[PDB]
Scaffold this active site. Structure first.
Site, PDB file in Angstrom:
ATOM      1  CB  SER A   1      67.160 -18.497  -5.763  1.00 54.42           C
ATOM      2  OG  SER A   1      68.030 -17.369  -5.789  1.00 54.42           O
TER       3      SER A   1
ATOM      4  CB  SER B   1      71.132 -21.086  -4.139  1.00 60.25           C
ATOM      5  OG  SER B   1      72.496 -20.708  -3.975  1.00 60.25           O
ATOM      6  CG  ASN B   2      68.479 -22.531  -8.505  1.00 62.28           C
ATOM      7  OD1 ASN B   2      68.525 -21.546  -7.762  1.00 62.28           O
ATOM      8  ND2 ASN B   2      68.627 -22.443  -9.818  1.00 62.28           N
TER       9      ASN B   2
ATOM     10  CB  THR C   1      22.283 -24.753  18.177  1.00 65.59           C
ATOM     11  OG1 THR C   1      20.900 -24.707  18.524  1.00 65.59           O
ATOM     12  CG2 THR C   1      22.890 -26.026  18.723  1.00 65.59           C
ATOM     13  CG  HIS C   2      21.080 -21.192  15.107  1.00 64.18           C
ATOM     14  ND1 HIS C   2      20.855 -22.533  15.393  1.00 64.18           N
ATOM     15  CD2 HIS C   2      20.957 -21.081  13.763  1.00 64.18           C
ATOM     16  CE1 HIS C   2      20.640 -23.187  14.263  1.00 64.18           C
ATOM     17  NE2 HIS C   2      20.710 -22.323  13.255  1.00 64.18           N
TER      18      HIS C   2
ATOM     19  CB  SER D   1      40.317  -1.722  32.796  1.00 68.43           C
ATOM     20  OG  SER D   1      39.961  -0.392  32.439  1.00 68.43           O
ATOM     21  CB  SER D   2      44.526   2.003  31.820  1.00 63.71           C
ATOM     22  OG  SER D   2      43.640   2.569  30.857  1.00 63.71           O
TER      23      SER D   2
ATOM     24  CE  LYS E   1      35.594  -4.556  31.472  1.00 68.27           C
ATOM     25  NZ  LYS E   1      36.461  -4.895  30.322  1.00 68.27           N
TER      26      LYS E   1
ATOM     27  CG  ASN F   1      39.502  -7.268  30.317  1.00 64.62           C
ATOM     28  OD1 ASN F   1      38.285  -7.218  30.519  1.00 64.62           O
ATOM     29  ND2 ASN F   1      40.276  -6.195  30.378  1.00 64.62           N
TER      30      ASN F   1
ATOM     31  CD  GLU G   1      40.955  -9.771  25.080  1.00 65.77           C
ATOM     32  OE1 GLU G   1      41.975  -9.053  25.246  1.00 65.77           O
ATOM     33  OE2 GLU G   1      39.865  -9.581  25.660  1.00 65.77           O
TER      34      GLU G   1
END
Lengths: 477, 478, 477, 478
Positions: free
Chosen positions: A97, A139-140, A186-187, A332-333, A338, A340, A345
């Site tokens: 509640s 409280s309700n 498409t597809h 990238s480490s 690179k 991203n 993401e």
């Protein structure tokens, strides 16, 4: 360490703190993710707002003195201006509640109001938490009122501006690239020409639909439980208290917007009204779950936006490489140089979390038991998390990705030249069956449509150049 | 036309030809909810028939019913699970949550058929009582969960696992066929370092083998049956040993059935039925089935990456990645002639979303226990059996209509190996990460290759580079 | 066994059947739950409706003859009046665009139309599936149009009447029992008096809110993709085809309602309009997912109704036994004379299946890939299953449970007499602290509030009888 | 105030006192998404610190770095997982989907701290390179999944399982305390037959033991680590044996850590780390974690029935079932004075819904693999670790604040045993189901007891009834 007492006996609190026995007990009784799962402050702030207008309304109905009302009001304001954030240590995983957070707000306002009247802090409080600060309230009814109020303000003032900002930034790129012809897929197969602007207008439409649904839902969550008290009958509540408190709460929220946001028009005016059926307002959260659903749909739209920007920026040499996203950081480490699509993401993970929040709210909404749904803190925490995610994530994506979106014009034009489904315009001339023969030929002998159409004596080199014009295919009227 | 039937509530009509009784006629009228499409799965009905067979035999051997009666129930049971009475079961999933009405639907069909086999004629006076004889020592509360576990165990062991093993086996063919074809890996959909097509295919094989192994491990746990618990799990009105003897007889029946169905074949798992250690948990929850639902959920997530990856890699033919050539099983479009779509990928992806949804539905149903009995049993059974058929049919469809005849665009793949600038990764232990970054940035922003950029920048000589840059050696650095 | 051919070669179909090569191929290529997961006929019927108005519109734009248009139109009507249900064997688990079902409808209409013109069935068809029956159309725009049309008709004509029926039956019992006082329960603990009518009005409100949300969403799903063709540009579609087809489809659906349902006003008029953004109408199903969300909320409301009717009918001797539900059948194979709340159990399982359908639609809606979402058959099958579940289940519960709901008046009155939280009215007299002392006393020494209030010298026997009146507590104004 | 830091993209400012570098400053600004509350869990950061420690030692023993460097990295690592640098990790969950920025956040803090430990002073020239030394032989692609599995393995083994075993153990006390208290079972919330309170409690014990056993079985499968896979799973730029030696050293480190944390204690499971058999599947999917998510989902469904059943049975005190008396830990209401609510039940029920939601979220993330790398890793980690803390804290809370001091209303329970009409169930093998139904219908519709109804109907004599109707014998019919 101060000493306080209740029905269950005696207990300690720090001497600095304004909270009392009920808060002390809930602290110890609900040791569940206390580090990370604190009841959201937006709920505490909205409870403070409601107690302020409750104090004013109780005085106008002659149910409390103006000495007490005034001290409570000043206490309430200190809380929603953020001068007592550390007086609220209770977790989401309390009573279903939200009673304990309601008591927490009652005790902190009670003791502070008592300090402002007296001038010092005494064991005997001038301002009672139950008799004064909680007068005419359960409280309700007050916890659902704080849920709807806190989520209405998050949605109207934070979520909608963020979504409108992302729409406005996509519209800039939509217009900027409206005349850049690319190949539709498409597809994930080669289709017919369209403009980059047309493709961006798809996301603008989906997000505008989302904004329109949220604007329509807001007035319905502005229907408040307040005045239903224990089970919805309004026992121990004065006649007209629900209507008068909603008037005052409309005016307080109107003033609050205009202190927070200068020279701006709210996207939606928040007009609070008593719920038509107080039983439904206690037993269910249908209106909050409908808003949850609007946020779920928003998330699915934002999912395609993210996934499409990731797909079209794939490369730089072994992918689609239509889109160039701003490079905000090293990717990238281990793989030097690179970069991203990290804004995509972030948004995609945020969207999965919004959809999961919606599934959790759906299950919580379904668990009604007779007069009271007792999953309220979980519904509040999930919708308020979704509000903060939509607010911050759409703005991040808009500013750190869409704002500086550029095109690989050479690669895009290579695709327009090479798509065999340019043949689509010829089917009303040479027929669907003869067009298929043409494409089958062009594929087998790795030649273009033009050379192939002549080679099969199906269209002249002159007629072909007349019929097949990419930019006219994207805008055929 | 009709046969007046009688229950503890009163009389009602059924078609003359039907073997179903009063409580089936009632249920049919009382639960008119998607009656065209949401029939209780026949696998539940067949499993109930199998349980009624061994239940009869076990009751005879414990001296609780007659060989005359017991022999009659057995012959009717066999007619049901051989499929000679499929139109005697018209009740929907959306019935009572204990599945009582389907239990009584089988009790009535077997009651009246066994009664016609003894008397040799159908008289309104039944020689075999559906409650006193056919349902002897049973509740719906213990028998419906027993039929759930039995039905899903046979579907999972005999149909799902052979389908998953078949798809793994067809992927392994291609994994071997292409183990030495070097392509470029993509992380975040950005060009990364060399790997083999076979190495990439080994990823899906590993995920699908993990799924099979989790499913094989879960099967003996769902072969723990509620049988013997009766009303609330106390075993009231069930004779001592009935559960243990019924489970032995059921093991032997299912063993015989497999060898009737599948010749020159070893079951992937032996189904050994045992009584649950706690009959209260066996009625009040479906934890073991929800754990199997979880295994199917994880299988769906693995199949989803297999679908999405095959769709991505076959994108084109001219404006996509174009590494994979999927078999063209149909023309493909209504307006764009000669366009062939990855339709097997789309089918499998939709199936995987449905399986995940089925798992969410089953999860929610499993959470709604109230005291001694979970009353969402038909919903749990329907979702799990639907997932079994989807997994069985779709993995075999994808195996045979996509993977088996998968070919490569070797020209396009070799183009990618030559052009990836992340081949620079191999130079990091010689010149460092920092000077490797400066190099690829120069190669990118001067439209120049890696070798030209390392000379013009003076980072590594053209001979030292030819030593450290071999794509086949990069995929298998040993 | 007839022989037919296509690009991929030669294949057999039964000689009786009207479907051709593309249907034959999809049958064999997608052997996935073929027994149970047939594409829903409501999709096939709506495709037939669209092809009819497409034929008429194509003739009005002078793009096809009236000989062909007329034969197609008669073929279309035979299909949506259910005279060719067995010409459609393809499953949900086909191509994600629904292309194969679109071809299935094209081939059956093509061959039947060809039979009506010729008078006999020949290998050479007068009516081409692509050039005539599919003219100006893709599956990319016509399958989403059939999804929205089929779900608009299910929702307006089947779902809304069922929900309105259940509301109307609850309203009869709401009024019938408005003056019957019972005890409210919060957290399943004894609370304060309310009427049975008040409690039923809670469910009526939740279901009315659900109906109002669905009525508001319907006009938005009546925005159709038609005319977008391959990628949303409208290539190979005539100018005005989208607008003219939506006019004709509005009039066909208007006539269809009035043939199906005599002397009735539709709950909502279905006015079809072209989608403002054809790209969004192909790439997404935001409007169908918003309706999915409305059905999700409906399910959570129906969940409490079912669970509350199960709880209040618990017994007959060891439960609450406030409600007497009609006894439709024997409850137990082993426990003679036991009668179970089986209509509640049916509705609760249906509701979990609706919520699961919504989670599946949500995930499917989120899987957009550039120009086309290719989870369309799954979204259609889940929403159309939800429509049939809501239609049949709410009507079952209304007619087999709510219609003949009765009360255990003696047990209900026993609860009103015995609830210690009647003390709630005394807190404004004797204070919250002294009221708690009273309840603690009444519990310890297993005595009533009255006897206890006198025994503690806190209220006179006269004053107590004056302050505590159950029926006045349920309606305090 | 500030320290100019440098990356391959350029220069940026950080606070002078911080050990975090350029890529941490960038991430902080680039992903301003719920920064107040959605910090990457510290369990991921501590596990990354533990991996960096053994990685240093393994690289030294394989002759790839120096003892000078290796020794420095180890000491900084220990400071991080002992909790002496918690303010050096401000990045959010909603970062890159590989967790690269958190990997580089740890690389930078350890880089600069190890550099200050060798030089004895902080110079802008770093002796330890974060990429060349600290991250030597590692990708974020293999190390972040290794830290996911390591972090969740330790949470699950050392916190979750002891919490679940504690709740089972407190339930077993009450199961034994009340094994001989007869109550009435309820099916469909209707009166059924006798059972003991202990038998009912044995149902939750069985469901919770099944959950523990599934979790213990899954733990060795998640101790298969991605380490050695590097960029795409080929192991490019990782020396042979590095993975196998790192896993041995990690096993030994975690073994030592447990015995530092918990004295006079046997771990519920030994964590034995091994390289994954397929490194491609270890990067491209999180099947093993999603299987553990499934185990937690099933645990949540079992805990949900325990919550709902305790709430139901404690309903009242005057207008409900009133079988259970839950400890009253607080006053309970703001307007209804003396009202005490089952708040421990409500807490646990909300937690169970959140765990199920967490499982749905993790399921959806696990399904979104693209080629060589799942880029929903932080979301999967955050959901699973949140579920570990919820399970750990909430089951212990419910055990100690509800179950431990559970008492019964023995008066009300005995009332129910006397009044249940389904005691007639025991008479079915004597008079039949049909005549047993007629009897209870007469008892119900004449407000009369069972014995009076069987005499007045003439079904069984008053002496024969006293033989077949014993509630204690009905709960344990043997």
């Amino acid at each position: 360490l101060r000493v306080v007492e209740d029905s269950l006996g005696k207990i300690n609190v720090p001497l600095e703190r304004y909270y009392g026995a009920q808060t002390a007990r809930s602290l110890g009784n609900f040791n569940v993710c206390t580090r990370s799962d604190t009841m959201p402050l937006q709920i505490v702030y909205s409870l403070a707002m409601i107690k302020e207008v409750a104090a004013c309304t109780n005085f106008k109905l002659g149910r409390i003195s103006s000495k007490l009302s005034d001290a409570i009001v000043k206490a309430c304001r200190e809380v929603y201006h953020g001068q007592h954030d550390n007086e609220f240590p209770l977790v989401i995983w309390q009573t279903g509640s939200g009673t304990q957070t309601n008591m927490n707000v009652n005790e902190v306002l009670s003791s502070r109001a008592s300090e402002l009247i007296d001038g010092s802090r005494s064991s005997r409080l001038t301002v009672h938490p139950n008799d004064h600060v909680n007068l005419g309230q359960s409280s309700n009814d007050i916890f659902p009122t704080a849920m709807n109020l806190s989520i209405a303000m998050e949605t109207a003032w934070k979520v909608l501006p963020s979504l409108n900002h992302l729409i406005n930034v996509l519209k800039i790129k939509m217009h900027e690239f409206m005349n850049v012809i690319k190949i539709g897929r498409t597809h994930m197969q080669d289709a017919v020409p369209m403009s980059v602007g047309q493709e961006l207008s798809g996301y603008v439409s989906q997000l505008q639909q989302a904004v329109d649904s949220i604007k329509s839902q807001l007035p319905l969550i502005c229907h408040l439980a307040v005045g239903g008290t224990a089970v919805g009958t309004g026992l121990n509540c004065s006649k007209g208290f629900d209507e008068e408190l909603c008037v005052s709460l409309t005016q307080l929220t109107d003033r609050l917007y205009r202190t927070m946001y200068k020279e701006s028009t709210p996207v939606v005016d928040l007009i609070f009204k008593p719920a038509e059926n107080k039983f439904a307002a206690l037993a269910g959260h249908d209106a909050l779950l409908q808003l949850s659903g609007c946020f779920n749909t928003t998330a699915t739209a934002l999912m395609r936006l993210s996934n499409d920007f990731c797909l079209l920026s794939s490369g730089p040499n072994c992918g689609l490489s239509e889109f160039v996203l701003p490079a905000n950081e090293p990717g990238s480490s281990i793989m030097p140089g690179k970069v991203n699509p990290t804004q995509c993401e972030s948004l995609r993970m945020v969207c999965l979390q919004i959809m999961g929040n919606h599934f959790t709210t759906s299950m919580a909404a379904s668990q009604g038991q007779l007069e009271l749904n007792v999953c309220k803190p979980l519904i509040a925490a999930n919708l308020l998390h979704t509000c903060e995610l939509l607010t911050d994530s759409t703005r991040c994506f808009a500013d750190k990705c869409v704002r500086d979106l550029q095109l690989n014009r050479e690669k895009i034009q290579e695709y327009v030249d090479k798509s065999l489904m340019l043949v689509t315009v010829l089917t009303p001339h040479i027929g669907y069956d003869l067009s298929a023969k043409l494409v089958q030929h062009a594929s087998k002998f790795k030649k273009g449509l033009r050379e192939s159409a002549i080679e099969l004596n199906l269209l002249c080199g002159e007629k072909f150049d007349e019929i097949v014009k990419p930019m006219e295919m994207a805008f055929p009227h």
